[PDB]
Homo-oligomer: A and B are copies of this chain.
Amino acid sequence: LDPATLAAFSAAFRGELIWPSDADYDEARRIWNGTIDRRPALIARCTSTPDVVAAVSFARKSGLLVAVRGGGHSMAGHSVCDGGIVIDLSLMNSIKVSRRLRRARAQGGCLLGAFDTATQAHMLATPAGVVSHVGLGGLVLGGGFGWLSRKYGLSIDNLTSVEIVTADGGVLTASDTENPDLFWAVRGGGGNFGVVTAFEFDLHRVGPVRFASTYYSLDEGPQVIRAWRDHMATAPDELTWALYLRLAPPLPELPADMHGKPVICAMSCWIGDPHEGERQLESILHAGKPHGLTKATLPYRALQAYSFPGAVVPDRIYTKSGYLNELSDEATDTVLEHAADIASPFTQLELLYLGGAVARVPDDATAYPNRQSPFVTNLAAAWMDPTEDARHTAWAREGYRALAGHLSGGYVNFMNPGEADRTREAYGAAKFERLQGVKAKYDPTNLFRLNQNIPP
């Protein structure tokens, strides 16, 4: 590197630098997808927006390929690079909540659990993903969905402004009143337009949530999935119900004869009055025989921290995903036949139903595509042993292929390292064209290309 350039970086940088020789280098460069093993030239742990400014500008002048890291959960491995710089936001974790204004201002490196802890100090919340240690940054920039989404929308449907550092080092505010073209693009366009150092969200009062998790035997799979698909077509916004087909975890609530066998783990909640919730959940828990039933009245923060049963983080993952407009009987039989071949205790075949308030937002209103498709299937393979990569990767590949005709589009935040080419078909032609024009305005040199990338 150039001494003078690096020294100008060091003169403006207040964060922490991790070099390949430093003690923590090997752990700092690991991301959630362990199949991604890469060695950056430098890890820049920023602690402020001026730190990001200095890091972006240093990267530009130095020609270092830029990775940006929030929570490290990229299913494509985007938050680490070979030979470049990781602009690592993990220390920018602050959240300021106004109870009176039902507002949260959160830094671009927050984990979901930090954000939910801060809003719930005032019994407030806003939609985000279901696993606490996911990063707010990548999740929100891709759109963001979870337990609160049928009632309150995607994360981006509650976003009111961002602070963002663009490729030329400038700092912008983007909102409905200021740079609205950029504000449109960051609501679903990924890290393509710069590093978001602060997000501002509208919040909602969310008291205790009635919640249930239970497991159905695979021989009752047909009636259970068909009951789910039929019920969610007309369900009220307050009800959320998701199916996770997986090997049953060896938990005392489950009969021993089911441990390790494929099952349907059904999780549901009611966002609203808990007594109504209990009535609503009891009315959907008995499409099959509920094994291992857990019912609770939870603070929202505890609902957020619940997923997933077993509380084990896999080392290695591979995902294939898409949306469905309908879940046909043939699609259902295919889901069931492939779930019966799950071989790792960490793998799940996920069936999610969105719709509700997500679908009421006009498709043109944000960069997020596929609001009118209520079904999401995620073949989320996950395992420990690197010698088993091919066996678990094949499971997700063949399940996807056996479903592919029924699938449309794709969530950019469930893309795997090999799906750089699914970008156009994920956004659709109109959105992709609009994204490209924003990119030419704000990142014409494509300095930010470790993402589901939109070339200028």
Contact = CB atoms under 8 A, between A and B. Distances in A.
A313 B210 CA distance: 18
A252 B312 contact: no
A411 B72 CA distance: 40
A182 B22 CA distance: 29
Interface string A93-122: 111101110000000010111101110111
A456 to B, nearest CB: 34
A414 interface: no
A316 interface: no
A105 B275 CA distance: 42
A253 B122 CA distance: 24
Interface in A119-141: 120-123, 132-133
Contact of A299 (B14, B100, B305): B305
A113 B253 contact: no
Contacts of A311: 120, 123, 207-208, 298-300
A407 interface: no
Q: How large is the interface on A (under 10, 10 to 19, 20 to 34, 35 or more residues)?
A: 35 or more
B114 A117 contact: yes
A304 B118 CA distance: 14
Nearest to A301: B305
Contact of A297 (B99, B300, B309): B309
Interface string A266-284: 0000000011011000000
A297 B118 contact: no
The 9 A-B residue pairs with the shortest CB-CB distance, nearest first, are: A113-B117, A121-B133, A299-B311, A252-B278, A114-B114, A302-B305, A91-B94, A301-B305, A208-B311
29 contacts: A14-B50, A24-B98, A47-B94, A90-B96, A93-B93, A113-B113, A113-B116, A113-B120, A113-B301, A114-B117, A117-B117, A117-B133, A118-B133, A121-B133, A122-B313, A123-B313, A208-B309, A208-B310, A250-B275, A252-B277, A252-B278, A294-B294, A294-B295, A294-B297, A296-B296, A298-B305, A298-B306, A299-B311, A302-B302
